[PDB]
Nucleic acid binder design. Structure first.
Ligand SMILES: CNC(=O)[C@H]1O[C@@H](n2cnc3c(NCc4cccc(I)c4)ncnc32)[C@H](O)[C@@H]1O
Ligand SMILES: [K+]
Ligand SMILES: [K+]
Length: 543
DNA sequence: TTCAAAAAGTCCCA
DNA sequence: ATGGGACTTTTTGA
């Protein structure tokens, strides 16, 4: 995963541009996932320029025979550059690349082929740079995950990622007054799994700068969203973070010769965040958005979690075995008591759901194999081998033809609100048709004790408003270009209000629902009603 | 027993 | 061929 050169140079310049080579001519620069040496080779070039530009000052202050230009190459490799990686071939290539920068006496190069997370590191380091590996909870082998849970528990639990541990290792082995700069996924900035990691970073290092690329495609043909984190262990009372957040995700990364030109430009916005004021959540927004977010939080007395019951959709474990088109002839084998309406995330619009085109065979209600042999033999059994490889089938908890996570039917077969799990905008709809769905659609229904305060029509009105689209996206988890995570761990934290505008907001919502359900939809008037509703909500929240 | 999180997403076309 | 757009499964720890 080759890191773009402009970012590599920026990271190295970040850690080394103001190093006092005269005061300390023995800086230790480390990359614990160096690979072929994208960062370390640049570190060599930056160090070599630094030594040659101060070669005569060094010669005068120290051993004058040791400090010559001819001796710079040797000194850098013996005492300055350190790298670690698990790939033997990459280390071998990097060793040759460092050697080719210039046998006399066989210089030794501090490159280790090892697990960076298991190595007994004999000393701390002045500067650490690089791009660690990212491995999620699905693609990480179970034997290694037990080690991470037992030894890296301060940052790695549950659905945490591998690069959390590289953050902990880098922070642990950084010298006092040292500087670290890495490029990692951005998701830990907001994700629920990153809470322990954020607590660790906040209370161990001073975060100098965060570069957030949002959904920009930094790595070509890689579906990941990146950020650059720069931190130090310097004694300072400032504790203020420079945040450079991109404004246009469509931009290409090579607009200028250097990254810092892009950051200072009109493609990025800059603002400051007080690190001491960071809660367990990192709300990195400008003053206008902070005021906007704080107004809504203070004005709203209730949250969605207070008034609603949230649940994830069906997880069959093999969709091809249980989901059929409503026009599929094989449904003539299945009694209608077994069939449920099935929708995908794209079927969720604002305020209403598209008509179902798929049916779910709720195979849990099938009592035994002998009574409905045709359904099992001709429909579900076509994927029996894959069905039996599901975890709950291996342990015997689930029968091979049963849904892996069937949930409760009564939760779905009722009036409820559904929203897609990943979307570019708020899309909350009222479901009237007892729709079932997979985990790409989340549902909630209102608690009985809050039905006389909040109706479904009022909720979809304010939740689909432009005010709440901006409001939710302030702290939402940015996944990829024009995609946010609409998950209960943040959707249920949305705060809602009840005031003098309740009735008209609800009435406008009913009008929109009435038009959206017509045969000849005058979608233009829906937009006009939405604008009027947004004005009511902004009036209610005083913004 | 059984909840919900997780993009080095995935797949496609031009 | 690559880059950009539409769309989103089930494995997994707790
Ligand atoms: C996306 N970028 C990479 O994967 C690079 O990082 C190196 N890289 C991976 N993982 C490493 C590690 N520890 C974790 C580890 C080790 C062994 C098995 C397992 I599963 C996990 N330590 C040291 N370099 C490690 C790789 O060799 C590439 O150059
Ligand atoms: K001298
Ligand atoms: K991206």
């Amino acid at each position: 995963y080759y890191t773009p050169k402009i970012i590599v140079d920026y990271i190295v310049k970040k850690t080394l541009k103001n190093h006092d080579i005269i005061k300390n001519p023995y800086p230790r620069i480390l990359d614990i996932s160096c690979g072929c040496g994208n960062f370390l080779l640049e570190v060599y070039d930056i160090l070599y320029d630094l030594f040659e530009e101060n070669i005569y000052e060094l010669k005068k202050k120290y051993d004058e025979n040791y400090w010559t230009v001819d001796n710079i190459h040797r000194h850098i490799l013996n005492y300055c550059i350190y790298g670690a990686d698990i790939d033997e071939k990459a280390i071998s290539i990097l060793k040759d690349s460092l050697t080719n920068k210039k046998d006399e006496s066989d210089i030794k190069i501090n490159l280790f082929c090892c697990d960076s997370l298991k190595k007994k590191w004999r000393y701390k380091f002045d500067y650490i740079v690089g791009n660690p590996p990212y491995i999620g909870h699905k693609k990480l082998e179970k034997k290694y995950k037990k080690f991470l849970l037992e030894k890296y528990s301060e940052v790695y639990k549950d659905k945490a990622d591998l690069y959390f541990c590289f953050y902990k290792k880098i922070i642990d082995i950084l010298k006092q007054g040292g500087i670290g700069s890495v490029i990692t996924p951005r998701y830990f900035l907001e994700s629920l799994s990153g809470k322990d990691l954020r607590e660790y970073i906040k209370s161990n290092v001073n975060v100098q700068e965060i570069v957030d690329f949002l959904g920009a495609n930094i790595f070509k043909n890689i579906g990941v969203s990146s950020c650059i984190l720069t931190f130090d262990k310097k004694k300072t009372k400032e504790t203020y973070i420079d945040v450079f957040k991109i404004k246009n995700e469509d931009i290409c990364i090579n607009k200028f010769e250097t990254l810092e030109e892009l950051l200072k430009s009109s493609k990025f916005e800059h603002f400051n965040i007080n690190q001491r004021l960071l809660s367990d959540e990192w709300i990195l927004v400008n003053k206008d958005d902070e005021t906007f977010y704080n107004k809504i939080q203070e004005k709203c007395k209730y949250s969605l979690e207070d008034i609603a019951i949230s649940f994830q959709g069906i997880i069959t474990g093999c969709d091809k075995a249980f989901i059929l088109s409503k026009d599929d002839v094989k449904l003539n084998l299945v009694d209608d008591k077994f069939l449920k309406c099935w929708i995908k995330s794209k079927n969720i619009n604002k305020y209403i759901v598209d008509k179902s085109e798929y049916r779910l065979i709720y195979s849990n209600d099938i009592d035994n194999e002998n009574t409905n042999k045709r359904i099992l033999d001709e429909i579900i059994g076509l994927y029996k081998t894959k069905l039996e490889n599901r975890r709950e089938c291996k342990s015997g908890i689930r029968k091979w033809y049963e849904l892996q996570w069937g949930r409760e039917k009564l939760f779905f077969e009722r009036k409820k609100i559904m929203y897609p799990y990943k979307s570019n905008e708020n899309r909350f709809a009222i479901d009237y048709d007892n729709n079932f769905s997979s985990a790409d659609v989340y549902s909630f229904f209102i608690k009985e004790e809050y039905l006389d305060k909040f109706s479904y029509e009022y909720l979809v009105g304010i939740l689909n408003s432009s005010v709440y689209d901006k409001y939710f996206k302030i702290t939402a988890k940015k996944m990829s270009k024009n995609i946010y995570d609409y998950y209960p761990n943040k959707v249920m934290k949305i705060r809602i209000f009840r005031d003098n505008n309740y009735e008209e907001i609800e009435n406008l919502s009913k009008q929109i629902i009435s038009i959206l359900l017509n045969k000849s939809i005058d979608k233009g008037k829906v937009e006009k009603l939405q604008i009027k509703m947004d004005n009511l909500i902004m009036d209610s929240l005083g913004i």
